[PDB]
Symmetry: D2
Subunit: 116 residues, 4 copies
């Protein structure tokens, strides 16, 4: 798993379950091409987005659909989504975990990057 | 001042000074059109981006150029930039402060919306 | 104003108003002695805690009563309070702002230290 | 594992390894009694602090020794430690993960609380 996403809910003190995530990769024409998508599990984790072969060098955008998440729980949140944009694999293959901690008017995101 | 941006540096414990910030408004065709921009001041703040008359309801994106900030400090960062995307709503309070707290591999952001 | 405290609410997107804050200074016997206290204002800020003359080098603790804040909003929170413990250092910049961003099961805190 | 601690480094984008953690529990006389201690592993996790039997109702303080961590890496940080104080098990046994994300002048902490 070269790319994993983990989402936590700071209101409930729980994993954020069933959060939609869309990943894009910048193409040669500078547009955002759809790359992979999925949703978080009961553990707040999303695995299996991509493979070592497919996850080449590039600029990637991980869009976490926080608004849709909060609305389903009866909260009208501030943000449309949380976007995480980064260059990947520019010094060879790495494993990336993108973590996000969500509140209705705030989020934090961090990356853990390891060398296989 | 319906929209203010404040940026802080979690490594040095200081305002993040001279950070480029670009604001975009989402157009009818879903593209992002430039709306306003500037650089944070010595206090890490950017005022005067827009006016009440111009800041109508709509979807806005605030892009903070965090990569350039870290590179100028000799620090290699993770993100290309920080992006804060939100809907302006007239029902809610009138003044929006978008705050961002920056680390090389992490950022947080919150909105303080008041009257 | 060598020491200011600012508290924000990440659920409502607002200042955290009327939050009790207590500051302690560590004594020679390692106990925490009361130093200053107050409640945050309508802007979520607490000014006037101390003076330059009184705020000497030492270890300080800022306790923010987050539990009472959430309970007053009908929300069950995790922490008893938020505690920020730090050393005041004369070598560094003169003004300390301790900021805290509150959620029911999480808080963040940063220091903005300036001249 | 009713109590687990996980620590991440926001400067390096990595687990925070070898971070000392001391847990205290408030006694009947209102003093903080030493309860358990340990340090984070290569994954930034600390397991095995306590047991279901030992981890009774109480007010607990988890002190994460962030200053000692940052100093070893050549950074003079702001905080002495990060303290996390909470009532545990007041509605029956729960599993607690205390997570902390560290920077030299800032930290964030969150709790994930699950029912076994
Ligand atoms: O709004 C101001 O005037 C203000 C002034 C000084 C500090 C801050 C901090 C905000 C913040 C953002 C994210 C986070 O995780 C913690 C704190 C805000
Ligand atoms: O890496 C994991 O598996 C993991 C597991 C459980 C919790 C977390 C939390 C991360 C986090 C993110 C943002 C923040 O502000 C504080 C903590 C990460």
């Amino acid at each position: 798993c070269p790319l994993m996403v983990k989402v936590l809910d700071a209101v409930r003190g729980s994993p954020a379950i069933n959060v939609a995530v869309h990943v894009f990769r910048k193409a040669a024409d500078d547009t955002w091409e759809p790359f992979a998508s999925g949703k978080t599990s009961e553990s707040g984790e999303l695995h299996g987005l991509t493979t070592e072969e497919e996850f080449v060098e590039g600029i990637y955008k991980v869009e976490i659909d926080t608004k849709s998440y909060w609305k389903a729980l009866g909260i009208s949140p501030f943000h449309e989504h949380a976007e995480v944009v980064f260059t990947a694999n520019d010094s060879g293959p790495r494993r990336y975990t993108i973590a996000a901690l969500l509140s209705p008017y705030s989020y934090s995101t961090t990356a853990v990057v390891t060398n296989p």
